[PDB]
Amino acid sequence: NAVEIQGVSQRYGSMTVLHDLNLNLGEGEVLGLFGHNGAGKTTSMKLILGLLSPSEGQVKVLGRAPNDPQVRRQLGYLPENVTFYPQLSGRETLRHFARLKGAALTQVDELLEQVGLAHAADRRVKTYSKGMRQRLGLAQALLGEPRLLLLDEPTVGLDPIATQDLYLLIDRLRQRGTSIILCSHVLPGVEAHINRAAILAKGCLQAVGSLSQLRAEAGLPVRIRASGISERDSWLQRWTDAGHSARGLSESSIEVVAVNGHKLVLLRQLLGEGEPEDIEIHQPSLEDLYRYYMERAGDVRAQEGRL
């Protein structure tokens, strides 16, 4: 709906730096573009913008081509490691950008309060921090009524309190009907706030789905630590013959390592004894899926300690 990509591919010379990318995006679903060695971490990111052209197919941003100014008036974008014009003041930097995007000038002093920059407004950009510039680079993306945000590493250098409510600002925005696209390298911290992932490598798309979808896709184990389980023996062996590994932790707790294709029906079996007693599930995270799909893309692991 918001971003539709139909089979596009991109080449600098004749080598395909992006090959056969086919994405989709709804109106409220946020999306995590993750790449590390393929070019599509950034050349697909330019292709949502009007920075490049789809050399094979075509893209559709909000049902339109991404070079129209009516598209870009409702499109926010935040690049990584941006420093602004450092001799210019902070409030006039947004007042420069609000004139460019056609935003009303009443929105400028609200957004400096909305990113928490009113104490640091009317100061130079050279006397800002890294994350203090990142509040400013967020604030230009919130100009107007931005239907689409593209945030390439939005939380780098930020304060730890300032990271969390930024996602709540995103959760304010995606509940308001403006789908965003994230592009991070730090995978825990976006995985609690992403809605579906867009992991891709080697210039091609590897997998797109929810975090529930990829653990349904990838065969990847969980750890179900169930504390306080009584009777200790017949509830231990019943997971071993069912194709799983039950750890016999001797403090009345049974840790079942399963394959998660039978995830909820063992979880209903964990309420079948009547005393589950504050269980804990350890799903494999986003970076655990990222280690999987490089082997699916053929990128080998390192040695026992390399990087």
Partner 1 sequence: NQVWNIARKELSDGLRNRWLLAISLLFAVLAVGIAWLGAAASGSIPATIASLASLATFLMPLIALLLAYDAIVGEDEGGTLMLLLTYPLGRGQILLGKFVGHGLILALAVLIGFGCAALAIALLVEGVELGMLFWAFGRFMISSTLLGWVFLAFAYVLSGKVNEKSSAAGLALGVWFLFVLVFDLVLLALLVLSEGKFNPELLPWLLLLNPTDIYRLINLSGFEGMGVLSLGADLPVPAAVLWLCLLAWIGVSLLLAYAIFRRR
Annotated binding site for ATP: 35-42
Under the binding rule (CB under 8 A), the answer on residue 88 touching partner 1 is yes
Instruction: Answer with the entry of partner 1, its own copies, none that 100 interacts with (C-beta below 5 to 8 A by kind).
Output: partner 1
Helix/strand/coil for 128? coil
Tell me the two tokens of residue 23. Answer: 């994405």
Under the binding rule (CB under 8 A), the answer on residue 77 touching partner 1 is yes
Task: Report the residue number, 108 or 254, with the smaller CB distance to partner 1.
Answer: 108
Q: Which of 12, 20, 36, 100 binds partner 1 (CB under 8 A)?
A: 100
In Å, how far are 3, 28, 92, 105, 127 from 86, measured between CA atoms? 34, 35, 12, 22, 8
Contacting residues for 97 by C-beta, under 8 A, at least 6 apart: 103, 140, 143
Residue 140 Cβ vs partner 1, minimum distance, rounded to whole Å: 8
Task: Report the residue number, 20 or 68, with the smaller CB distance to partner 1.
Answer: 68
40-59 positions binding partner 1, by CB under 8 A: 49-51
Tell me the two tokens of residue 278. Answer: 């504050």
Return phi, psi of residue 47, to 5°: -80, -20
Beta strand ranges found along the chain (DSSP E)? 3-6, 8-11, 16-21, 31-34, 58-61, 75-78, 148-152, 180-183, 196-201, 204-209, 223-226, 245-249, 253-257, 280-282
Instruction: Answer with the entry of partner 1, its own copies, none that 84 interacts with (C-beta below 5 to 8 A by kind).
Output: partner 1
**Gap between the Cα atoms of 143 and 140, Å rounded:** 5
Q: Residue 123 CA to chain centroid, in angstroms?
A: 32
Instruction: Answer with the entry of its own copies, partner 1, none that 218 interacts with (C-beta below 5 to 8 A by kind).
Output: none
Task: Report the residue number, 50 or 276, with the smaller CB distance to partner 1.
Answer: 50
* Residue 251 burial (10 A CB sphere; 0-12, 13-18, 19+): exposed
Residue 68 Cβ vs partner 1, minimum distance, rounded to whole Å: 8
Please give the annotated binding residues, written as ranges: 35-42
Task: Report the residue number, 83 or 252, with the smaller CB distance to partner 1.
Answer: 83
Closest C-alpha to 252, from 221, 224, 271, 225? 225
Under the binding rule (CB under 8 A), the answer on residue 131 touching partner 1 is no
Instruction: Answer with the entry of partner 1, its own copies, none that 158 interacts with (C-beta below 5 to 8 A by kind).
Output: its own copies
Report strand pairing: 223-226 vs 180-183.
unpaired
Q: Which of 69, 160, 274, 298 binds partner 1 (CB under 8 A)?
A: 69
Residue 66 Cβ vs its own copies, minimum distance, rounded to whole Å: 25
Q: Which of 1, 37, 55, 81 binds partner 1 (CB under 8 A)?
A: 81
| Number of other CB atoms surrounding residue 104 within 10 Å | 9
> Residues 102, 105, 110, 111: is their CA dihedral positive or negative?
positive
- For partner 1, how many residues bind (rule: CB under 8 A)? 30
Residue 118 Cβ vs partner 1, minimum distance, rounded to whole Å: 21
Instruction: Answer with the entry of its own copies, partner 1, none that 271 interacts with (C-beta below 5 to 8 A by kind).
Output: its own copies
Closest C-alpha to 48, from 214, 185, 210, 198? 198
Residue 250 Cβ vs its own copies, minimum distance, rounded to whole Å: 5
Q: Which of 140, 178, 253, 260 binds partner 1 (CB under 8 A)?
A: 140
Q: Interface residues with partner 1 (CB under 8 A)?
A: 49-51, 69-70, 72-73, 75, 77-85, 87-88, 92-93, 96-97, 99-102, 126, 137, 140
